[PDB]
Design a protein around this ligand. Sequence first.
Ligand SMILES: Cn1cc(Cl)c(C(=O)NC2CCCC2)n1
Ligand SMILES: Cn1cc(Cl)c(C(=O)NC2CCCC2)n1
Ligand SMILES: [Zn+2]
Ligand SMILES: [Zn+2]
Ligand SMILES: [Zn+2]
Ligand SMILES: [Zn+2]
Lengths: 75, 69
Amino acid sequence: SQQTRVLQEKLRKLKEAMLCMVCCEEEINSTFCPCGHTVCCESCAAQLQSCPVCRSRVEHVQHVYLPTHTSLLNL
Amino acid sequence: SQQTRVLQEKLRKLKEAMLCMVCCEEEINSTFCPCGHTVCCESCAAQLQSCPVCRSRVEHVQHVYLPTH
Ligand SMILES: Cn1cc(Cl)c(C(=O)NC2CCCC2)n1
Ligand SMILES: Cn1cc(Cl)c(C(=O)NC2CCCC2)n1
Ligand SMILES: [Zn+2]
Ligand SMILES: [Zn+2]
Ligand SMILES: [Zn+2]
Ligand SMILES: [Zn+2]
């Protein structure tokens, strides 16, 4: 029904929000510290000097283990 | 249809996975450092001395700003 189409769109948008903002292909699993923005995969976070969202200096990257993780790279 | 019921269940389960594993009522927004388990809201994370997933000591809690918030 039309409701099935609406629910498919909501599911897809929530899953898109869990992907890396730089490569768009891998799940987010890294945090820029100390600002706390958690918007990249490990590969893309590794080479940023400043946060891509707030411009704060990245002192280090903290790996995050999230219950929503489903990609083979995070399991 | 039955597929509408199936998609409603999948969306519900994905939203449940974003909720604090301790209180079940608030969105996850905190990481236990250094282990990296990100499974609690800020109120439950402030009260735990050990990670509820791996039992590693919590040295400090890092707030996470996620695009899904
Ligand atoms: C961060 N972001 C936002 C959207 Cl929208 C997407 C996306 O559709 N990515 C796809 C490309 C390869 C498969 C996943 N990623
Ligand atoms: C962590 N988790 C797993 C499930 Cl399942 C739930 C849940 O249904 N929580 C509800 C209680 C108050 C409204 C949301 N939470
Ligand atoms: Zn990436
Ligand atoms: Zn930032
Ligand atoms: Zn909680
Ligand atoms: Zn842990």
